[PDB]
Amino acid sequence: ALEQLQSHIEGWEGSNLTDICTQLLLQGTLLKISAGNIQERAFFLFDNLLVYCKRKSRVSLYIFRGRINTEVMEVENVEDGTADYHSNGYTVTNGWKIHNTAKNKWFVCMAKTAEEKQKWLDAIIREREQRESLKL
Ligand SMILES: O=P(O)(O)O[C@H]1[C@H](O)[C@@H](OP(=O)(O)O)[C@@H](OP(=O)(O)O)[C@@H](OP(=O)(O)O)[C@H]1O
């Protein structure tokens, strides 16, 4: 299934899913504020890896846009109503920030609903906790 999924993503960069991941933990679409732009992206959280893609319009389903090793990923909650440097003045709701150390930058994610934000934050915590746990 990892190899299937990757085959549906054009312009892949870097190591293959089957080589460094075992499990798609969560997928969903989110608004991303980065470098002053707002764009919708499909996000995929795997063990060890966060990937985001542009979904192809129907006018292969995805175009690869970014990946982050979760072991160097930092995450920060954003309180609703925040409008600041990283949101470039946009009023954030249902949001959080992700640190991409590989490019020395943060970007902001926003989910459609509060429940969806909570799903993402909990999944990121669980990925971290499993990764740090003693293995069986
Ligand atoms: O689409 P354009 O108009 O070219 O602007 C791009 C997109 O916002 C990118 O987001 P995405 O990768 O999702 O398509 C991207 O990097 P991030 O992935 O780091 O957010 C760029 O940030 P910089 O590379 O810092 O310029 C920004 O310049």
Q: How was this structure determined?
A: X-ray
Amino acid at 48: N
Integer Cα distance of 73 and 100 in angstroms = 6
Integer Cα distance of 53 and 44 in angstroms = 8
101 CB within 6 A, ligand 1: no
Distance 55 CA to ligand 1 centre (A): 15
Q: Are 35 and 49 in contact (CB under 8 A)?
A: no
Pocket-testing residue among 9, 34, 68, 106, ligand 1, by greatest number of atoms within 8 A of Cβ: 34
Resolution in A: 2.0
Domains of the chain by start residue, with CATH? 1-136 (2.30.29.30)
DSSP letter at 15? S
Integer Cα distance of 84 and 80 in angstroms = 12
Rg of the chain, C-alpha, whole Å? 15
Half-sphere exposure of 89 (CA within 13 A, CB side): 1
Integer Cα distance of 58 and 96 in angstroms = 30
